[PDB]
Amino acid sequence: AKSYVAPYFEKSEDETALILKLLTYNVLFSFLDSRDLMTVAGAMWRVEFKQDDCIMEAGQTTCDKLYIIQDGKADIIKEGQKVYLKVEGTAVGELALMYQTPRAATVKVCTPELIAWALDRDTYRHLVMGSAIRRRETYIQFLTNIPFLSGLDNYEKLQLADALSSDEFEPGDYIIRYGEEGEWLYIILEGSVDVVGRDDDGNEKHVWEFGKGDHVGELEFLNNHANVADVVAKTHVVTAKLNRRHFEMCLGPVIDVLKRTSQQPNYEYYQSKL
Ligand SMILES: Nc1ncnc2c1ncn2[C@@H]1O[C@@H]2COP(=O)(O)O[C@H]2[C@H]1O
Ligand SMILES: O=c1[nH]cnc2c1ncn2[C@@H]1O[C@H](CO)[C@@H](O)[C@H]1O
């Protein structure tokens, strides 16, 4: 991990800046610092495809690159059926580079053009991958039991795991602080928490108690406002958190469920804050 020298491929400073924006939202790069992000972007090169081009084909064994889509879209096709639609900013060909397997599916361009940014297997495995498989596999056992994640398919739960990181809190620790910017959605894996808002007069007000499998922090993501309450650990608590920049990338399919949840009777407090 230390002595690996990535290739550098010629590109303009505009292309590098465009790449960095992509790496910012795609979860494969969630935990890279500035320098490794700069080096990963140096190690990438632009490719182009036409409609119906197969960027890769199920069962192939030369698998020495993944791609990050800048523009256009691609179908993911297993056993002849389209199973998944890959859109701008997402990755294709990452599974074979992570698990050293043949391509799990055909990837076929379904827009007139597709522009994507390619990355070789060695630079990914060495600079990017890190503990992604250990991280995926530690979280997935929990994730399949989180109720609001039921609308994420299996591929999407493992993708969310690429962007999660965990924390331990002690009784009385502030996980979320009232009036500050919401930056993390927390999934509770062990313990209990209190939601503490304020009334009109500004007094502390107990709102709700949440536990294992619950989620907090997403209200400020949905409707772009300051934290409406504290969230305080009642017990020794353990959480996985998702950064705001990965919110839509990872939770797109259950966003409508989070909005439904925010109109339930236990968000009456939050309801009257507008
Ligand atoms: N269920 C799936 N959902 C979304 N994308 C998939 C799925 N299966 C395969 N793919 C994508 O298709 C790619 C085909 O090659 P890879 O297996 O290297 O990496 C794969 C993923 O990028
Ligand atoms: O009325 C509420 N009911 C239930 N949970 C709430 C309510 N208001 C806020 N939170 C929780 O506390 C976080 C900090 O603002 C919110 O993002 C939400 O998860």
Numbering used by the authors: 216 to 489
Quote the study that presented this structure, word for word.
Cyclic nucleotide binding domains (CNB) confer allosteric regulation by cAMP or cGMP to many signaling proteins, including PKA and PKG. PKA of phylogenetically distant Trypanosoma is the first exception as it is cyclic nucleotide-independent and responsive to nucleoside analogues. Here, we show that natural nucleosides inosine, guanosine and adenosine are nanomolar affinity CNB ligands and activators of PKA orthologs of the important tropical pathogens Trypanosoma brucei, Trypanosoma cruzi, and Leishmania. Substitution of two to three amino acids in the binding sites is sufficient for conversion of CNB domains from nucleoside to cyclic nucleotide specificity.
To confirm the binding mode of cAMP to the converted binding site, mutant 6 of TbPKAR(199-499) carrying the triple replacements in site A was expressed in E. coli and co-crystallized with cAMP. A molecule of cAMP was bound to site A and an inosine molecule (captured during expression in E. coli) to the unmodified site B. Structural similarity of mutant 6 to wild type TbPKAR was very high (Cα RMSD = 0.430 Å). The only remarkable difference is that cAMP binds in an anti-conformation in mutant 6 and in the syn-conformation in the mammalian PKAR. The E311A and V319A replacements created additional space inside the pocket to accommodate the bulky phosphate group of cAMP. An altered conformer of cysteine 278 and slight displacement of the loop between β–2 and β–3 in site-A allowed R318 to be accommodated so that it can interact with an exocyclic oxygen of cAMP.
